[PDB]
Amino acid sequence: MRNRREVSKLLSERVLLLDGAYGTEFMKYGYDDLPEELNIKAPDVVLKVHRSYIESGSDVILTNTFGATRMKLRKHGLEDKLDPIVRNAVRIARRAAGEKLVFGDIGPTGELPYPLGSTLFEEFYENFRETVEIMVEEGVDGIIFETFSDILELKAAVLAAREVSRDVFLIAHMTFDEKGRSLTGTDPANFAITFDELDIDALGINCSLGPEEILPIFQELSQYTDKFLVVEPNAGKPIVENGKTVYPLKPHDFAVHIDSYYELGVNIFGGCCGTTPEHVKLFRKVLGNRKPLQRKKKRIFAVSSPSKLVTFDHFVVIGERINPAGRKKLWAEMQKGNEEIVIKEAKTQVEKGAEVLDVNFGIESQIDVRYVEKIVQTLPYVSNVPLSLDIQNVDLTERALRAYPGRSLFNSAKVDEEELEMKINLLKKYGGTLIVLLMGKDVPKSFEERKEYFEKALKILERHDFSDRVIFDPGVLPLGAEGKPVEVLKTIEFISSKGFNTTVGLSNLSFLPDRSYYNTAFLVLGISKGLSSAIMNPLDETLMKTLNATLVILEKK
Amino acid sequence: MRNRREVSKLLSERVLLLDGAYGTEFMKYGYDDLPEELNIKAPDVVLKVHRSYIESGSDVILTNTFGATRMKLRKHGLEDKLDPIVRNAVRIARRAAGEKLVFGDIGPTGELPYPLGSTLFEEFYENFRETVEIMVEEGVDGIIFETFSDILELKAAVLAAREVSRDVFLIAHMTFDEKGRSLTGTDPANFAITFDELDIDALGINCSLGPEEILPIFQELSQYTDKFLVVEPNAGYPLKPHDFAVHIDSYYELGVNIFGGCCGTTPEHVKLFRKVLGNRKPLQRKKKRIFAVSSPSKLVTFDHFVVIGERINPAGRKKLWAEMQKGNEEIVIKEAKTQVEKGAEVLDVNFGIESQIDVRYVEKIVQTLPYVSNVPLSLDIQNVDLTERALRAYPGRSLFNSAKVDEEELEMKINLLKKYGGTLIVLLMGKDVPKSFEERKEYFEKALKILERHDFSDRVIFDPGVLPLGAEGKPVEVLKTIEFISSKGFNTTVGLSNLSFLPDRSYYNTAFLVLGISKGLSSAIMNPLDETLMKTLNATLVILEKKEL
Numbered sequence A: 001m002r003n004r005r006e007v008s009k010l011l012s013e014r015v016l017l018l019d020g021a022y023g024t025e026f027m028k029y030g031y032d033d034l035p036e037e038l039n040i041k042a043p044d045v046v047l048k049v050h051r052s053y054i055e056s057g058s059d060v061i062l063t064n065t066f067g068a069t070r071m072k073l074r075k076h077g078l079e080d081k082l083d084p085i086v087r088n089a090v091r092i093a094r095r096a097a098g099e100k101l102v103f104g105d106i107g108p109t110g111e112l113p114y115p116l117g118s119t120l121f122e123e124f125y126e127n128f129r130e131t132v133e134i135m136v137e138e139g140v141d142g143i144i145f146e147t148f149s150d151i152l153e154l155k156a157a158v159l160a161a162r163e164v165s166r167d168v169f170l171i172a173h174m175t176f177d178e179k180g181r182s183l184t185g186t187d188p189a190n191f192a193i194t195f196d197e198l199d200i201d202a203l204g205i206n207c208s209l210g211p212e213e214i215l216p217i218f219q220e221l222s223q224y225t226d227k228f229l230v231v232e233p234n235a236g237k238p239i240v241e242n243g244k245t246v247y248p249l250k251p252h253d254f255a256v257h258i259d260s261y262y263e264l265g266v267n268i269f270g271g272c273c274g275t276t277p278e279h280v281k282l283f284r285k286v287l288g289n290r291k292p293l294q295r296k297k298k299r300i301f302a303v304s305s306p307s308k309l310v311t312f313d314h315f316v317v318i319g320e321r322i323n324p325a326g327r328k329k330l331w332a333e334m335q336k337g338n339e340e341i342v343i344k345e346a347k348t349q350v351e352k353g354a355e356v357l358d359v360n361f362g363i364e365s366q367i368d369v370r371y372v373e374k375i376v377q378t379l380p381y382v383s384n385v386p387l388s389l390d391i392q393n394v395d396l397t398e399r400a401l402r403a404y405p406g407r408s409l410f411n412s413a414k415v416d417e418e419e420l421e422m423k424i425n426l427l428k429k430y431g432g433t434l435i436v437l438l439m440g441k442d443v444p445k446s447f448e449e450r451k452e453y454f455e456k457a458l459k460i461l462e463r464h465d466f467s468d469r470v471i472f473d474p475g476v477l478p479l480g481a482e483g484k485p486v487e488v489l490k491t492i493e494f495i496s497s498k499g500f501n502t503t504v505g506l507s508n509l510s511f512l513p514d515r516s517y518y519n520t521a522f523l524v525l526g527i528s529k530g531l532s533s534a535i536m537n538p539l540d541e542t543l544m545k546t547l548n549a550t551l552v553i554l555e556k557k
Numbered sequence B: 001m002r003n004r005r006e007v008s009k010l011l012s013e014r015v016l017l018l019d020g021a022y023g024t025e026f027m028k029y030g031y032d033d034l035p036e037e038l039n040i041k042a043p044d045v046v047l048k049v050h051r052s053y054i055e056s057g058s059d060v061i062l063t064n065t066f067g068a069t070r071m072k073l074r075k076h077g078l079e080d081k082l083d084p085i086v087r088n089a090v091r092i093a094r095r096a097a098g099e100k101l102v103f104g105d106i107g108p109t110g111e112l113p114y115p116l117g118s119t120l121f122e123e124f125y126e127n128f129r130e131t132v133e134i135m136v137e138e139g140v141d142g143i144i145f146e147t148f149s150d151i152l153e154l155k156a157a158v159l160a161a162r163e164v165s166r167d168v169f170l171i172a173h174m175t176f177d178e179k180g181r182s183l184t185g186t187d188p189a190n191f192a193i194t195f196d197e198l199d200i201d202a203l204g205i206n207c208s209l210g211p212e213e214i215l216p217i218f219q220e221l222s223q224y225t226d227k228f229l230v231v232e233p234n235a236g237y238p239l240k241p242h243d244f245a246v247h248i249d250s251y252y253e254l255g256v257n258i259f260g261g262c263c264g265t266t267p268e269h270v271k272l273f274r275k276v277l278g279n280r281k282p283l284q285r286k287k288k289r290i291f292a293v294s295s296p297s298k299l300v301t302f303d304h305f306v307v308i309g310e311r312i313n314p315a316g317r318k319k320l321w322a323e324m325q326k327g328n329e330e331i332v333i334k335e336a337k338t339q340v341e342k343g344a345e346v347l348d349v350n351f352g353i354e355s356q357i358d359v360r361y362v363e364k365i366v367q368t369l370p371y372v373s374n375v376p377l378s379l380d381i382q383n384v385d386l387t388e389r390a391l392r393a394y395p396g397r398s399l400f401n402s403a404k405v406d407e408e409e410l411e412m413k414i415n416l417l418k419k420y421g422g423t424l425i426v427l428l429m430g431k432d433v434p435k436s437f438e439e440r441k442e443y444f445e446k447a448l449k450i451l452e453r454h455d456f457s458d459r460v461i462f463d464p465g466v467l468p469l470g471a472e473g474k475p476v477e478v479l480k481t482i483e484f485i486s487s488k489g490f491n492t493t494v495g496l497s498n499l500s501f502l503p504d505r506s507y508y509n510t511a512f513l514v515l516g517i518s519k520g521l522s523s524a525i526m527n528p529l530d531e532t533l534m535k536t537l538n539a540t541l542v543i544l545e546k547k548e549l
């Protein structure tokens, strides 16, 4: 069993060849059973197929365990056979492989995350954890999550795997349709940006499409990650012959694409549905011995939900309204667990032009940890947009970052060591970006004092390798309370000039009659100084219409 | 007959003494007739009073003609005696004066301007012109307009006198109450700012108050004009020669050029003036400089954002345009008062298809609104004839809406403003409407040279030229231009509503106004009835620490 350092070393030296399909091979041998059941019922057939790929030149084979998790096996009455199904698979693959690499293969459960299905993050996590435990015990050289269709389920899988073993090489794949989107709406850039920063070793694509159609999708993925890359196309577009779906792309037509994947930085090439030992033999000849190509990723500041990637290259409206402060009806409905009221609020803000939603749960001691976990997982699917997680308890913060389906914005660390460190460390583990609020030991009054917090923040962020994952909040103070908003505008201009995104808690300025007018005037002024987002009320039609006018006037849209 | 050059040369050299009262004095000889009638009925007594002042030390005497204009004499059945009253007065004063100066004295008519009374500017102008002609014919060394209470009437007086003669030394006075206001509301700074730029030689104050009470009022006047200054306080009449004459040094110290007495003063007062004053060269001063426009009761300085109400403009307004064409005044008055109530500090006034409007209507509107709405006007007039009529009749210092950057147009509009008073909006376009910041800047730079050679660079606001968004308007280019002009020390304005003519026009107007203000925009022609725009305006100025709560 090789660890991820050894596998990464090997990959850095040469492009490796994976294996082909298993189901279609088993069928040609007269076995139409659920593939995973053959590990118990006909281990000889599984061994023969592995050996046919080893003899065809594969450097890596996948264990016969695509469907071997409790949640998937339960659908076939096999839940109680998880342990022997998986141990047998690994032993059988190791027997075939000798010195070649054996990767534990895990596919998705077929269950959609709540609220599309019934399953919460923690249930998927435990499901994947149990299979990974068996595989690591049995001595796999790596774990590959093949054919995932949803980012929250894949996030659970990779986090569970890494929890079991910090040492195992981990590969995460999504499968994309012809429009370049997963089942729940994720495009390759979103997949790459969300997963590049998790502690996986490689990203990749398999299934759904043939080698030609995967090319531009793979290219997009390759542009946004510097990690190892893997591809396993189906053997062309499926056709039906005598009422069965067949993947008819022949070895040469398939193999001729290898150079194009090599040019995009591929590290491991194999095949999915319809790929046979004949294909792999040719791939072995065509690939040969190649050192992988170097690439440099494109870097952007973006946050995501399953279906939406929001890049801060334009003014971002962050809806403030899911926040029960001074909202008696929302507060009461949150305390009891009303989800529908939160969903309606989320959807209305989006309808009015919010691109990200801030989500805050008032007095957090009064709120059900499970309600939080539920709403966090739910809103990105139903409202379509990413969230700004506005959470104070470090503990609830962890639960929310875990269950968050995409790459979130995390609403706020002040410039304080203990606080920045805990929050940077959670975001490093679970993914995400951070709003850094420019205050600490005291609330600053002047531009100069804010500048000092900015530079102090930059120091801390540089030392934690986190400078590229922050937006700064200069700290809007109430007008009535000597807020000195000119000092905030000066700060916006300054940070903006340094290349960093900014945001404000806009409504805090006018905490007054005619607040809509103070908020509107400040936002216009802030945008003219470079303000790149704001946490604000999208239901304020004066504010939103004057915002649109401002962007039009300034040639931003 | 000395000309204004000669009289100016003498004032440069020495502070001069005027004379005392005539009206209050003539009785003490047994004469209670209108003083002006004594020029015909008792010329010996008029001669005696003048001589007593000359002996007492007056360097200048006033002709006995304070009430001698047709409109005033008509109230006494004496209008047909104008010519002999004035000609005798001059001949008598000249006999008394010898080598000393004789100034033709003209007081106000006692008639209030319409709408406070019935009198139009034109009638006041004709009235004063007649009297000035007679005095200039008979050979006075200057003309002084004493005791005026209203700036429209005083404006008519000084323009009439200048039309008769460009050479006669002209002194314009107002009289102020204890609160430092003329009858129709003008304070000493407004007086100075409005009249300083007119072709007069001296400004001053007489009557209503004693020397003590006038002092802070006179000081305020001295701070806003560089022209010669005159004062004639009343005698308190309890104020004796000694008490009165001890104030002279404080007036000297404020740059007084001629010191005299009004009601209640006597030859004995003048004797003491001469003893106390002696022979002094006048002090030099340099006035405070401000950019301001005015109405009779309101001076608006461009040291804060100035809202200029756009609404008196019939374009796209069917009912307002009907009414203008049938000479409706009440409709315009209503539009004026509402805009001011909503926060307009200046009102733009435009007459649409000008050829279709009665000039007498424009003249009447132009004179009326500053009195009833209280605020200055931006005169928004294309027709050069109508422009003259409006500027001539405007009660105060107006803003004139719009010269383009064109040698011929600027010269002709600059000259009208030089003659009638006023400030100018210079619109940054010429043969072709610009698109870029760079074009607008070139237009600005040209405009500045033209203005520089006509010595008008300080009486201008620049309009960078707001183009419609729906017509490739590039508002960013206008914003860059505002910033550049402000960086150069000049005021700016825009026709704000031109940007958004689009639905949700209020939101485009609002966004642009905020952004322009952030770049230094000094004013805007805009709709003060747009509550969103006005509330967001107040918010902007608060946030930027330019004002309010």
Ligand SMILES: N[C@@H](CCS)C(=O)O
Pocket: B020, B021, B022, B023, B024, B062, B066, B105, B146, B147, B207, B262, B263
């Ligand atoms: N010159 C006039 C002034 C009256 S206010 C007079 O001495 O009677």
Ligand SMILES: [K+]
Pocket: A018, A019, A020, A021, A062, A232, A270, A271, A272
């Ligand atoms: K494979």
Ligand SMILES: [K+]
Pocket: B018, B019, B020, B021, B062, B232, B260, B261, B262
């Ligand atoms: K006198």
Ligand SMILES: [Y+3]
Pocket: A252, A253
């Ligand atoms: Y072929």
Ligand SMILES: [Zn+2]
Pocket: A206, A207, A208, A233, A234, A272, A273
């Ligand atoms: Zn496949």
Ligand SMILES: [Zn+2]
Pocket: B147, B206, B207, B208, B234, B262, B263
């Ligand atoms: Zn008097």
